[PDB]
Design a binder for this molecule. Structure first.
Ligand SMILES: *O[C@@H]1[C@@H](O)[C@@H](O[C@]2(CO)O[C@H](CO)[C@@H](O)[C@@H]2O)O[C@H](CO)[C@H]1O
Length: 492
């Protein structure tokens, strides 16, 4: 009798298991198993229900902040990567290097590495088990960055030999499960790493099988094909819970769903029609109709996980149908249909939400039409106008995701053409280097106000992430877009 193999029915798969390129709603549930970070979040600290904020040692046994721009890490000794190579400071230095991650040479290998990274200087290797991470300018975000999904540790020699692309198809990490196979757009299979330095894996094997249609995914749990299924909606809860051997398990996660624009298109170069579309979205009626009250509507680009830079005083985002109609008229919009691209229901409630917004927009005089696209076939940028997206809020600080995504160095401005006000970009630079205080707090509030004025994206809500599982598979969700199995997976 060997350990049970775990069968997962998932909404989607990443195109690469290179851990930075796998950042998405579907990559972390896999790369969290293959790799470790220096510091890890313990969502279950002191009995919490999967939402604790505590950081604990992981690949680093201890660490110390030296000054405003450096942190020294002492590494756990005798940790082995899946191919046997011992983890050393040289691997950590390479993970956070100019070459691999944030320098100009990393642009083709990890396209978002520089824009999502801090203003890093080269790491300093002090000895085989001691490494210092540094920024060129002050950064009080080194610790939260190192605990995050940007900071999974890769093996220097193996990664350099294969290159980022081939490493992404045959990954080697220090994590509790090791790579077996990756069939693009179909499945990922991992196996127990019984040499793991931490809590030993409890499943013999893990299979991530794509089941893009949620109804088929629910039928596969009912029939006994899957142990756990992902990305359901609250409308599936009553049916699943009627089965005595199945149950749903859900939690609000530190992510928001949104829609955004290709601002290289003429109709979206100016803010007026973006604002008109934002002002016509009735979020509470969408939360009632599609989420059974379980989703949460934030007061702007502002979330409690930001800690000292969360503002609980902020007003709700605006809803004004009559001001929206007047903006449609002033924009010169001529009635032509505007497309909105969606990858089916990769996002829970994506197509039901869009159908509701299409009617809301018809009532303001804007004609929007759904265009679907297949997994791994994202349209050419110049064929897209509106599209859905999401952002995981990956730091204990407001820096992420407004600055990495929407800042002067980010993709919304550089790729998608948002001509941000100069004041917004000046504030992004200030919050990057400032320590917490009134100046920094007020700068984030001004950035949030400009974001709502400009509408380069429209925040909808934080999703209630719904899984379903067999009652004999013990596993709790966490408040983030990943699955955790360390000390959180057992059978019987
Ligand atoms: O939020 C998703 C984005 O991260 C991105 O995701 C994938 C995941 O591997 O990343 C590549 C591009 O880096 C993309 O082709 C894959 O789907 O895009 C999707 C689709 O827009 C986002 O939903």
């Amino acid at each position: 009798q060997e350990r049970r193999a775990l069968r997962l029915g998932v909404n989607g798969l990443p195109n690469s298991l290179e851990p930075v390129n796998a950042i998405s709603n579907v990559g972390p549930r896999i790369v969290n198993q293959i790799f470790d970070t220096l510091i890890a979040r313990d969502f279950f600290a002191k009995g919490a229900p999967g939402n604790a904020i505590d950081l604990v040692p992981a690949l680093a046994e201890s660490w110390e902040r030296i000054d405003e721009k450096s942190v020294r890490f002492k590494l756990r000794q005798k940790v082995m990567f899946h191919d046997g190579v011992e983890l050393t400071a040289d691997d950590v230095a390479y993970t956070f290097s100019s070459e691999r991650l944030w320098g100009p040479e990393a642009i083709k290998k990890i396209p978002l590495g520089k824009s999502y990274s801090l203003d890093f200087d080269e790491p300093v290797v002090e000895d085989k088990y001691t490494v210092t991470l540094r920024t060129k300018t002050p950064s009080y975000l080194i610790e939260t960055f190192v605990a995050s999904w940007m900071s999974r540790i890769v093996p220097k020699e193996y990664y350099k030999k294969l290159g980022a692309v081939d490493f992404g198809n045959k990954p080697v990490g220090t994590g509790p499960y090791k790579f077996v196979e990756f069939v693009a757009g179909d499945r990922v299979v991992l196996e127990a790493n019984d040499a793991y330095w931490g809590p030993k894996p409890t499943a013999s094997k893990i299979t991530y099988q794509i089941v893009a249609e949620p109804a088929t995914r629910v039928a596969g749990l009912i029939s006994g094909e899957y142990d756990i299924i992902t990305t359901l909606t609250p409308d599936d809860i009553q049916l699943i819970n009627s089965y005595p051997d199945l149950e749903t398990r859900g939690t609000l996660i530190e992510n928001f769903h949104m829609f955004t624009f290709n601002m290289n298109q003429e109709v979206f170069k100016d803010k007026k029609l973006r604002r008109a579309l934002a002002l016509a979205v009735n979020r509470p009626i969408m939360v009632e109709a599609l989420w059974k009250k379980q989703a949460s509507i934030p007061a702007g680009f502002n979330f409690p996980n930001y800690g000292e830079t969360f503002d609980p005083k902020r007003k709700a985002m605006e809803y004004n149908v009559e001001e929206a109609k007047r903006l449609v008229k002033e924009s010169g919009y001529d009635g032509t249909p505007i497309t909105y691209h969606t990858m089916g229901n990769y996002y829970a409630n994506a197509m039901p939400a869009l159908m509701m917004m299409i009617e809301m927009w018809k009532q303001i005089g804007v004609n929007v039409v759904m265009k679907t696209y297949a997994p791994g076939s994202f349209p050419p940028d110049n064929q897209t106008w509106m599209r859905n997206w999401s952002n995981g809020q990956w730091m204990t600080d407001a820096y992420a995701t407004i600055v990495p995504e929407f800042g002067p160095n980010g993709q919304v401005q550089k790729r998608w053409g948002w001509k941000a006000p100069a004041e917004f970009n000046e504030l992004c630079q200030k919050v990057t280097v400032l320590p917490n205080g009134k100046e920094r707090f007020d700068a984030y509030n001004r950035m949030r106000d400009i974001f709502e004025e400009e509408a380069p994206a429209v925040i909808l809500y934080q999703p209630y992430d719904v899984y379903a599982a067999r009652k004999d598979v013990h596993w709790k969700p966490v408040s983030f877009e990943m699955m955790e199995f360390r000390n959180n997976l057992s059978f019987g």
